[PDB]
Design an enzyme around this catalytic site. Structure first.
Site: not given
Ligand SMILES: COc1cc2cc(OC)c1OCCOCCOC(=O)[C@@H]1CCCCN1C(=O)[C@H]2C1CCCCC1
Length: 123
Positions: A45, A55-56, A70, A96, A113
């Site tokens: 992703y 960005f991630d 989420i 969130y 995403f």
């Molecule tokens: C690098 O890891 C992360 C990625 C994202 C959010 C995070 O925490 C808020 C993150 O740090 C804590 C670990 O993930 C917790 C869950 O995150 C999620 O449920 C979602 C769906 C799966 C991909 C990761 N997810 C995220 O929300 C990313 C976001 C995506 C938007 C930009 C900031 C990071």
């Protein structure tokens, strides 16, 4: 932009039809079967906040429908076939929410995403 195409032409995949999770398929997968609650899921992703400020990107693994991600992911990925790629746009209520996850995610943030579904086995 990719986000805008979703919020104009994007499929509403919520049960409530509150447009909280919008989806476009960008590349189609193979098979009829999409994964069931409890499957181990493997994806690539990339992701961003609507704000453009964070960005991630991922071999990212989680148990579908087990709340490890989420609500939008649990909903969105379950609609995906193997080898599919799609775009999800998400309102805060399926991410969130009003509280967010500071400091990474602010109050009431929208997220985009791009997701490729690789494989899911049973648990
Ligand atoms: C690098 O890891 C992360 C990625 C994202 C959010 C995070 O925490 C808020 C993150 O740090 C804590 C670990 O993930 C917790 C869950 O995150 C999620 O449920 C979602 C769906 C799966 C991909 C990761 N997810 C995220 O929300 C990313 C976001 C995506 C938007 C930009 C900031 C990071």
């Amino acid at each position: 932009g990719a986000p805008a195409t979703v919020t104009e032409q994007g499929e509403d995949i919520t049960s409530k039809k509150d447009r909280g999770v919008l989806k476009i398929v960008k590349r189609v997968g193979n098979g009829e079967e999409t994964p069931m609650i409890g499957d181990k899921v493997y994806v690539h992703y990339k992701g961003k906040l609507s704000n453009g400020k964070k960005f991630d990107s991922s071999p990212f693994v989680f148990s579908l429908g087990k709340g490890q991600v989420i609500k939008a992911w649990d909903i969105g990925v379950a609609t995906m076939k193997k080898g599919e790629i799609a775009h999800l746009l998400i309102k805060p209520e399926y991410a969130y929410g009003s509280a967010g996850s500071l400091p990474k995610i602010p109050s009431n943030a929208t997220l985009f995403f791009e997701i490729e579904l690789l494989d899911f086995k049973g648990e």
